[PDB]
Swiss-Prot record:
This is Myelin P2 protein. It holds the Pfam family Lipocalin. Hexadecanoate binds at R108, R128, I129, Y130. SUPFAM superfamilies: Lipocalins. Belongs to the calycin superfamily. Fatty-acid binding protein (FABP) family. Keywords: Acetylation, Charcot-Marie-Tooth disease, Cytoplasm, Disease variant, Disulfide bond, Lipid-binding, Neurodegeneration, Neuropathy, Transport. (9Z)-octadecenoate binds at R108, R128, I129, Y130. Forms a beta-barrel structure that accommodates hydrophobic ligands in its interior. P2 protein and myelin basic protein together constitute a major fraction of peripheral nervous system myelin protein.
Length: 133
């Protein structure tokens, strides 16, 4: 299953191309301005085969709980109501969200002890680097 090295608290230290990613998702300007300023904490935990990813920031908190390979309903930080799934691939923790005939992916992987999130929408790609704290 998911590596235990994902478990714990992670802090955003770098974000690249997040503004264009949010645009591609259809996020409006005022929300994007706050989104670009946010430096969330992400807390990954597990109870049995249920994994929880909680995101905390001054602007927005989100939380998803899921089993790998099992579709679930998600309300995103930007309040999209999506059909989502999280699966592993070569140890990467990969999330897909689908809504209104659209799709976006968020791939979270461990790289030299950091967690790197790569987000893709319509060929637009974001990279967010987190330090374990
Ligand atoms: C919770 C982040 C700040 C709030 C930003 C709200 C508008 C965009 C939200 C949707 C995209 C979220 C992608 C997060 C990927 C990650 O975990 O780094």
């Amino acid at each position: 299953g998911m590596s235990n090295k994902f478990l714990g608290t992670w802090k955003l230290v770098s974000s690249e191309n997040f503004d264009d990613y949010m645009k591609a998702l259809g996020v409006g300007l005022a929300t994007r301005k706050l989104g670009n300023l946010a430096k969330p904490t992400v807390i990954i935990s597990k109870k049995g085969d249920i994994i929880t990813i909680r995101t905390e920031s001054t602007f927005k908190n989100t939380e998803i709980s899921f089993k790998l390979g099992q579709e679930f309903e998600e309300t995103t930080a930007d309040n999209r109501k999506t059909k989502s799934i999280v699966t592993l691939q070569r140890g990467s923790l990969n999330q897909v969200q689908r809504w209104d005939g659209k799709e976006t992916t968020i791939k979270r992987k461990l790289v030299n002890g950091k967690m790197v999130a790569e987000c893709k929408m319509k060929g637009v790609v974001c990279t967010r680097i987190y330090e374990k704290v």
